[PDB]
Design a protein around this nucleic acid. Structure first.
Lengths: 98, 95, 106, 79, 97, 80, 105, 95
DNA sequence: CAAGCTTGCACAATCCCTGCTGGACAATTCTGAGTGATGGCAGCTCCCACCTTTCCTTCTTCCTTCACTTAGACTACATTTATTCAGCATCTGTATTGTTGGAGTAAGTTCCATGTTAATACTCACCACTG
DNA sequence: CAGTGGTGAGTATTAACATGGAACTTACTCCAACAATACAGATGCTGAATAAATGTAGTCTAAGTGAAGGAAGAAGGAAAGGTGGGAGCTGCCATCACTCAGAATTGTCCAGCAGGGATTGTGCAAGCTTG
């Protein structure tokens, strides 16, 4: 039948998700993660729905920007794949450590 | 049962002034409120620091002008300064 | 017999509300009379500029309602406005269409 | 953990939005760690603001203030 | 004799990381500062403390920038730092606005 | 006019050594001079703005410190 | 009769000066009574920690006097003062002596 | 002539309380004055914004406490909060 | 150059959602004493730019010599594309505590102005850490 | 072998403390509307596990080239001075612009009602891609 060459649907997804605006992590697992992280600070802590949505928007935008910097790091090393060391380099040059 | 502050009415008026046929979402009007509040606070805080630096006790339009020159980029700063100066001139020559 | 200061300056932003916000927000213990006029003019100018760019980016995509995506587009595509809002995350706006030319097929 | 609720396809779609064309298999754990650290900081500061408010429901204002404190100003959630 | 290429480089690295004085010469930097300033406003006067402060700022900025450039170069599996590494450090760092 | 060349190649090498740089290309020096010039442009522009506000002709160290805290690179030891 | 608020608080920083600065620094209308005491205690603790670390560094250099370089070593060699002071540049303080592994022969 | 203002005597005092055998330079003294001023400014601005969020009008010790928690990292924040609580308790108990 | 899987492009019909009016009321605006912050002027120090002079610490070429970047070869890992099947997100729905606002009272608390000392900044003189 | 730069008395300044008298911020209930957990069920996108192929990353080897390292000749910068001198910093003197303080009055903002924009699906156009 039909088998697209490796990479072309990657470009298709790139174009789609750079054309879209909606969030890219399912709402409920992120809500669970937020509440789990909050429980380490104070108990019986209730969240506004807008609070969880703001946290999700923030985390998504942060991860997107970090991925763009990681991709520039990977292109620098003449690769096309992103690697954990690329993330580490980006987060060191940005400062997001210590 | 309380009232709430917003810049929505005036943003809408300016939008009708610059694009009389296009409306605006509600999410976008919330965004415009946040943007106006942020720029207001940036400019006012920078002018306050300017006032403390010179040991003056007043924000005049001069501290606002210097804060705009400090905070906005080149062409944006020039146009904003001209707009503000013309607005103050129109304000003064009308009693 | 009361002409509002917004009209007296020919502005659409509230000169009086801005004056009150300056007085409450304790920036200095005395606030000049041209400070609110100037600040309202500047805020209305910047609002008008972003709204003009967003209206252009909405008419571009065959729409009559500005949404957060159009504000993201109008900001990230302008050099000065993207420099003013470099560290500003806009909700439900996405990113600019951008693919590194290294990753494209030859 | 619930940190695994950020699935592989979710991180892959996020990488897609950022222009990434090919993703190693060890990206996912590292991205989960980065995301958890960022969330830790932001929710720590949000809960701090909530406690100083004598409250126990974390408003969106507390989140926006924590993010602005972190230098990551957020628009569209009031104020 | 002749030192191998790399021993003198590391000796210089250790020495200049040990010391704390200003690696640029005072007077040429001051002349540069003054020409930039006059391109902003004409016939400005300065302060010896102000020009010294500008030199401290600029050298700290450039030392940090070269540290980031070295990180980029090592990432690309090199030891030679090239302009593309400075450009990458600046772009990721956030100076492309 | 054109005093940027006074930032000689040995000066850039010394800065690089303090930064832990082992080998240096010869194309560095021009990119480094451009980077330094733009950084100085920003800082001195803000310092001169501060000086103009105080209706002065001298750019003291206070203006430099304030303008460096604006850019996000606060400095300790020249007051402020 | 008169006793300074610093001695009463068991402090070394001036509670009165800090109270004046808060009252004139334009941070709100009214400033509580315990606010300058709390703030001066915090400032004295922070300066005590930096002084401790810098004095250890100076002794490690066999120098009787603390110079900017010692402050730089005290700051950048700690894990939390480095975070609190990561965007701060110390004048004439130099840089920590570090060389990357690969650049070593 | 005029008088300048600094924390030189008090930094000297604390240094003597932690290192009786150690003296301090003058450039380092200016560095520590700048550091103390910066930290004071950070905590004061954070407390101002904290009060402005909660629609209060007073910087109490609680605003300074929350600002010290926000600005400082973990162990530094813990010990600074302990020091501040100790000092305010002694001050109240001596009033 | 034919055949595929993906996307853009055009209609039908909703749904909800941004317009749109309109009473209520807080917040602006007008006006007038009251007053203190801020221009305006003189005068003074003082540090800042300009100039002269050796004395060398740096800079600049220049060769040359080697280590390091880069280009091509080439394998296997390793990511990718599609598939199929549970399975967990989702979307209303509904009750339920609980928690946040909003009023009304009441008093600690802070401001405020005054009088007075005691802590500081600064000024002369003086030796000990630092080259 | 050295000395410029951290330190003792005295002293004028001033601002912090003491102390007593008013507004006023908030704390402290008390109550009463949203509204965020909490199940809970139908449904249905979607992710997770897997096989196949293929196409990148990593390792290698070899030219080549370009950067460092040392050698000598200039060479500007700096270190010490003097010295004019324009500007910042003070203090006095108005004086006018900002602040309360109290009535009118109206701009705006929740709360209810409606036309229309995106929207969601249903089907052509087409269209790049893979062979």
């Amino acid at each position: 039948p039909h088998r697209y060459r490796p990479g072309t649907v990657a470009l298709r997804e790139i174009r789609r998700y750079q054309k879209s605006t909606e969030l890219l992590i399912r709402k409920l697992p992120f809500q669970r993660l937020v509440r789990e992280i909050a429980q380490d600070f104070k108990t019986d802590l209730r969240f506004q729905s807008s609070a969880v949505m703001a946290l999700q928007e923030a985390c998504e935008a942060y991860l997107v920007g970090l991925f763009e910097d990681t991709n520039l790091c990977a292109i620098h090393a003449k690769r096309v794949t992103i690697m954990p060391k690329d993330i580490q380099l980006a987060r060191r040059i940005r400062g997001e450590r210590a | 049962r309380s009232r709430k502050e917003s810049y929505s009415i005036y943003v809408y008026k300016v939008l009708k002034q610059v694009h009389p046929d296009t409306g605006i979402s509600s999410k976008a009007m919330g965004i415009m409120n946040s943007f106006v509040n942020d720029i207001f606070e940036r400019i006012a805080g920078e002018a306050s620091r300017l006032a403390h630096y010179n040991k003056r006790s007043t924000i005049t339009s001069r501290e606002i002008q210097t804060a705009v020159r400090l905070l906005l980029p080149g062409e944006l700063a020039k146009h904003a300064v001209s707009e503000g100066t013309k607005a103050v001139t129109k304000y003064t020559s009308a009693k | 017999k009361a002409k509002t200061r917004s009209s007296r300056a020919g502005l659409q932003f509230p000169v009086g509300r801005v004056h009150r916000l300056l007085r409450k927000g304790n920036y200095s213990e005395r606030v000049g009379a041209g400070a609110p006029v100037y600040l309202a003019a500047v805020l209305e100018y910047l609002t008008a500029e972003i709204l003009e760019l967003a209206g252009n980016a909405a008419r571009d995509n065959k729409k009559t309602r500005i949404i957060p995506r159009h504000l993201q587009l109008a900001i990230r595509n302008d050099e000065e406005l993207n420099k003013l809002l470099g560290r500003v995350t806009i909700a439900q706006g996405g990113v600019l269409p951008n693919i590194q030319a290294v990753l494209l097929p030859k | 953990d619930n940190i695994q609720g950020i699935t592989k396809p979710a991180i892959r779609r996020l990488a897609r939005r950022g222009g990434v064309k090919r993703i190693s298999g060890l990206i996912y754990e590292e991205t989960r760690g980065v995301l958890k650290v960022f969330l830790e900081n932001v929710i720590r500061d949000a809960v701090t603001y909530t406690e100083h408010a004598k409250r126990k429901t974390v408003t969106a204002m507390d989140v926006v203030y924590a993010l602005k404190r972190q230098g990551r100003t957020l628009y569209g959630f009031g104020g």
